């Protein structure tokens, strides 16, 4: 229960056993700190957080001192001021005079706490000078300047405890103690870039970003990452027309304050390979063209081609926003087509988990649900690639409580112990009828995590049948307080696509289209497009589909528009445009509105308010931002969508394979990024830099 103490005269009540710095923070008292961080284990090595406690004779470390009832604490005594000056004096004596060349300058806690709590001038003029440190190479993402290191050990605690990358540590002793790997090893983890945020000083910096900006010259915009389906909340720092960097912001229910390396470093893909003017194919070459020319060409191809019903096929890629998908579907329906497909394998057919209830394709346990887990079954899913921050969440839960994790599918390099039950559907049948099935039956908060990659299999229904039967039986897995059935999407647009029903009709998957419209669709193959088909590509980068196209239309990227995205949780989130689109590119829903007017079927909304209206018409949860609400239809959905229609499906003998071959390049932006290509070569498994033994 909560106990009560006094800090600087004020009365504060805090849960028993919490650290004194937590009570100080709760009571609105500011305490300087370096090594303490809310998300890392307490260290107490920097000594900046000293306070006086009447029982204590000497000042105590606030970050590590447990609160007690009736405690009397003073943060403002002359002894405390003196101690702050003493500690800052000792911290600055070997620190390098690097501020003009250091990337931390202007957003540096050492600078700021020197100004607030330190002496105005130093006393250290020794003629033997300062200690110097070797620099260390830990890969192409994190540049090191280790003279600046103040030995707070935040990087080590993050790399060990949170990301599960034990290669980082501290070697030597005393004055010669050094953070590093003791020999040339990459800091090899998809979460590595977070250490740049955690380093209080410029010791670990963003290597692609180096020297390009100072913090005071950056416009800051709160927006949403679209590199995966987690929907991490981010701050985009831009200057003028270009985006400089991407940093996490706190959302304790989504990414908590981390992002993965793709979300952080694929931003440089937004300034290269961009689509800036409409293109028209003439022979074997593209030619630049006006918007009027290109839209007219689309209209003439439609008149000539004359698609009937489902000969107009629409395909939505991994990165598109909901408004664009809604406009594309409305225009496609007004053309008489029901052929609105997704860009994934077998996305010509409808998904086998169904579209009727949201709880059939979502993470029904919230992301925060993973904190309560006692047993987890992973089915055809490698979270470390599909949702990196959620993988970190699973590891944190595993480290702090007993929890049993098993998986059916490819062997995965995991940051937590996993029980491999085999790679086949027969293995799943055995498991759910065996010991781990019993584990799930007995647990208080079980959850089964199904990957979006199983949906893309032909035999998908088989799997969704098996799981479904099990779920319909086990009350611990599905009851009125807890839904443990979870589908983990990998692409930021899939949950919203299913939300608006961007799904083909049964007869539409039979037809051979004469006209194909790709909306950010760069997973398409040669096979998926008929040769006679007239192909329109709408996007922001030139990767694959643009190469397949007859007419190319430049659209805005996610940093250039205020879009809606639905994450795996079913959470509807709204982004903010940092910059405008380059050149002659356009907001994508406006593109669709114009082209529908060229096609006769001119859509009924030309304004942003009207588009948000239409969205509310389609689904009321798309306009209710940052909210998660449970389904009342949890039992109906499982029977009606997973167990019902999937009886006839015959399971294949083919083993489950890894869904994403390369974590670093998955969509058009990441495949346009020089940083992602460098990192893909640098962090490969067969490279000794990534091999501890």
């Amino acid at each position: 229960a909560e106990i009560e103490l006094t800090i600087d005269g004020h009365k504060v009540s805090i849960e028993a056993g919490s650290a004194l710095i937590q009570a100080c923070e709760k009571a609105g008292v500011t305490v300087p700190r370096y090594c303490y961080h809310d998300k890392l284990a307490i260290a107490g090595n920097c000594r900046m957080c000293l306070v006086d406690v009447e029982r204590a004779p000497k000042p105590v470390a606030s970050c590590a001192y447990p609160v007690a009832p009736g405690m009397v604490v003073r943060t403002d005594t002359e002894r405390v001021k003196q101690a702050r000056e003493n500690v800052m004096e000792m911290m600055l004596q070997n620190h390098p005079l690097d501020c003009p060349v250091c990337d931390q300058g202007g957003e540096c806690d050492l600078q700021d706490q020197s100004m607030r709590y330190g002496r105005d001038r130093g006393r250290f003029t020794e003629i033997t000078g300062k200690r110097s440190t070797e620099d260390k190479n830990i890969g192409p993402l994190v540049k090191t300047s280790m003279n600046r290191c103040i030995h707070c050990t935040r990087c080590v605690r993050f790399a060990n405890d949170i990301a599960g990358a034990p290669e980082l540590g501290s070697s030597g002793r005393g004055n010669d103690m050094q953070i590093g790997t003791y020999l040339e090893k990459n800091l090899n983890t998809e979460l590595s870039g977070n250490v740049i945020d955690l380093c209080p000083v410029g010791a670990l910096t963003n290597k692609p970003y180096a020297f390009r900006a100072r913090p005071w010259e950056l416009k800051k915009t709160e927006s949403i990452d679209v590199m995966d389906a987690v929907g991490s909340n981010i701050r985009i720092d831009s200057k003028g027309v270009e985006v400089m960097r991407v940093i996490p912001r706190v959302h304790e229910d989504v990414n908590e304050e981390w992002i993965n390396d793709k979300s952080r470093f694929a931003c440089d893909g937004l300034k290269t390979q961009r689509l800036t003017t409409p293109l028209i194919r003439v022979g074997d070459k593209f030619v630049n063209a006006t918007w009027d020319d290109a839209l007219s060409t689309i209209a003439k191809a439609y008149q000539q081609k004359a698609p009937k019903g489902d000969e107009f096929k629409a395909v939505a890629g991994a990165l598109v926003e909901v408004e664009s998908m809604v406009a594309l579907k409305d225009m496609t329906n007004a053309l008489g087509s029901e052929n609105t497909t997704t860009d994934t394998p077998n996305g010509n057919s409808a998904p086998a988990h169904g579209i009727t209830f949201r709880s059939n394709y979502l993470f029904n346990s919230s992301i925060a649900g993973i904190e309560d887990a006692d047993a987890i079954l992973l089915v055809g899913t490698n979270p470390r690639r599909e949702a990196a921050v959620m993988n970190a969440r699973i590891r944190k839960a595993w480290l702090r409580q007993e929890l049993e994790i098993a998986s059916v599918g490819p062997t995965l390099d995991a940051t937590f112990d996993v029980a491999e039950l085999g790679n086949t559907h027969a293995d799943l049948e055995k498991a759910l009828s065996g010991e781990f099935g019993e584990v799930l039956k007995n647990a208080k908060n079980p959850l089964i995590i199904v990957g979006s990659g199983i949906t893309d299999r032909e035999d998908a229904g088989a799997f969704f049948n098996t799981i479904g039967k099990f779920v319909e039986s086990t009350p611990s897995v599905l009851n009125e307080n807890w839904n443990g059935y979870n589908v983990l999407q990998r692409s930021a647009s899939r949950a919203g696509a299913y939300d608006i029903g961007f799904t083909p009709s049964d007869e539409a998957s039979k037809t051979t289209p004469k006209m194909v419209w790709l909306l950010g669709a760069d997973e398409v193959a040669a096979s998926d497009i008929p040769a006679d088909a007239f192909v329109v590509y709408q996007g922001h980068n030139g990767d694959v589909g643009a190469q397949f196209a007859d007419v190319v239309l430049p659209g805005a990227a996610y940093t250039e528009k205020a879009g809606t995205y639905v994450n795996t949780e079913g959470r509807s989130q709204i982004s903010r445009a940092a910059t405008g689109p380059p050149g002659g590119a356009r907001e994508d829903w406006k593109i669709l509105r114009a082209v529908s007017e060229y096609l006769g079927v001119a859509l009924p909304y030309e304004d942003a308010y009207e588009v948000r209206d239409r969205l509310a018409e389609i689904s009321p949860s798309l306009v209710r931002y940052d909210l998660v609400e449970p389904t009342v239809f949890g039992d109906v959905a499982v029977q009606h969508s997973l167990v019902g229609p999937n009886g006839s499906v015959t399971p294949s003998s083919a083993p489950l394979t890894e869904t994403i071959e390369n974590f670093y390049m998955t969509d058009s932006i990441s495949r346009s990024s020089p940083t992602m290509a460098k990192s893909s070569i640098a962090f490969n498994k067969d490279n000794k830099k990534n091999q501890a033994f």
Binding site: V87, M90, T125, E126, T128, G129, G174, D176
Partner: protein, 240 residues
């Protein structure tokens, strides 16, 4: 626990608590091993009652200070971590915790180290500073940086390449480390310096005069008017 507190325990239990209490004064009772080292005629290791006078301990176990009690500069009672005793306090001081604490030192591990008038106390304290710089684990900033700064200052004080006010600064420097660290190695590192300043300031002032007459005029940090940076190095100065 220490090995001597554990090793005496069965004898204590056999012979009774009152008997062990009978040796040494109140609150300093029993018999401790007293290793004696340094500038005594005969170094030794032996056990004795607590509260024994220092003069008597020396004369009767170790053959006395090399040169006689006139030739004694100081004594460190207990190991290097405790502040050194000047010549005129050990004539009256008892080898307890209470008596040593009252004169602002301690028993420590009862490791006596005597220093006669032929040796340099400044060099000995400099060596202790070097030891503490080498033995810091490096976890906490006040110790990890302060021990190195203390060693640099003591290297300059050894030759006299420093200004007199810097002594006060050195004193303040020890207070940066004392009471601010995770463990008590930092306090141990601060204490011998403080004993040195308190007891032998004029020694340091004499060495400073010797340098200033001998070599030249020195600025804070040990710089001098001909000293500057050249092609990677500092030239124009001794560089302790």
């Amino acid at each position: 626990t220490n090995v001597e507190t554990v090793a005496v325990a069965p004898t204590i239990l056999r012979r009774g608590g009152d008997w062990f209490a009978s040796f040494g004064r109140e609150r300093n009772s029993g018999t401790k091993l007293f290793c004696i080292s340094g500038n005594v005629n005969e170094p030794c290791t032996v056990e004795e009652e607590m509260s024994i006078p220092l003069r008597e301990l020396l004369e009767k176990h170790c053959g006395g200070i090399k040169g006689g009690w006139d030739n004694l500069l100081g004594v460190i009672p207990g190991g290097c971590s405790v502040p050194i005793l000047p010549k005129n306090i050990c004539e009256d001081v008892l080898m307890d915790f209470d008596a040593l604490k009252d004169v602002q030192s301690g028993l420590g591990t009862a490791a006596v180290i005597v220093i006669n008038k032929q040796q340099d106390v400044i060099r000995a304290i400099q060596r202790f500073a070097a030891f503490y710089k080498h033995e810091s684990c490096g976890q906490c900033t006040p110790c990890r940086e302060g021990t190195t700064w203390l060693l640099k200052a003591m290297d300059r004080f050894r030759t006299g390449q420093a200004k007199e006010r810097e002594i006060d600064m050195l004193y303040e420097l020890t207070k940066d480390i004392e009471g601010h660290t995770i463990c008590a190695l930092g306090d141990a590192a601060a204490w011998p310096i403080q004993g040195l300043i308190r007891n032998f300031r004029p020694e340091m002032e004499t060495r400073m005069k010797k340098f200033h007459d001998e070599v030249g005029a020195v600025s804070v940090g040990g710089w001098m008017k001909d000293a500057r940076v050249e092609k990677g190095k500092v030239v124009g100065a001794p560089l302790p």
